[PDB]
Amino acid sequence: SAFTVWSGPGCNNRAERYSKCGCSAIHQKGGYDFSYTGQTAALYNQAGCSGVAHTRFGSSARACNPFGWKSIFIQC
């Protein structure tokens, strides 16, 4: 599975993704999309998932709201 994000306002600008296994600290403060495909994913309010999860996903979630976490973890 892969995560996608834009820097602002929502998902209408910069294009940067995070699909690699484990987690990655996002800096794009705009939109936040997701695409499930066997691999589950959850957000972490602290960079490099150095804490507990907050918002999990099981299906592609193409949101374009402001941020709410710092990094995205995706199992493999």
Swiss-Prot record:
<keyword id="KW-0732">Signal</keyword>
<keyword id="KW-0295">Fungicide</keyword>
<dbReference type="GO" id="GO:0042742">
    <property type="term" value="P:defense response to bacterium"/>
</dbReference>
<dbReference type="GO" id="GO:0045926">
    <property type="term" value="P:negative regulation of growth"/>
</dbReference>
<comment type="function">
    <text>Antimicrobial peptide which inhibits the growth of a variety of fungi, oomycetes, Gram-positive bacterial phytopatogenes and S.cerevisiae in vitro. No activity against E.coli.</text>
</comment>
<dbReference type="GO" id="GO:0050832">
    <property type="term" value="P:defense response to fungus"/>
</dbReference>
<keyword id="KW-0964">Secreted</keyword>
<protein>
    <recommendedName>
        <fullName>Antimicrobial peptide 1</fullName>
    </recommendedName>
</protein>
<keyword id="KW-0044">Antibiotic</keyword>
<dbReference type="GO" id="GO:0031640">
    <property type="term" value="P:killing of cells of another organism"/>
</dbReference>
<dbReference type="GO" id="GO:0005576">
    <property type="term" value="C:extracellular region"/>
</dbReference>
<feature type="disulfide bond">
    <location>
        <begin position="23"/>
        <end position="49"/>
    </location>
</feature>
<keyword id="KW-0611">Plant defense</keyword>
<keyword id="KW-1015">Disulfide bond</keyword>
<feature type="disulfide bond">
    <location>
        <begin position="21"/>
        <end position="76"/>
    </location>
</feature>
<keyword id="KW-0929">Antimicrobial</keyword>
<feature type="disulfide bond">
    <location>
        <begin position="11"/>
        <end position="64"/>
    </location>
</feature>
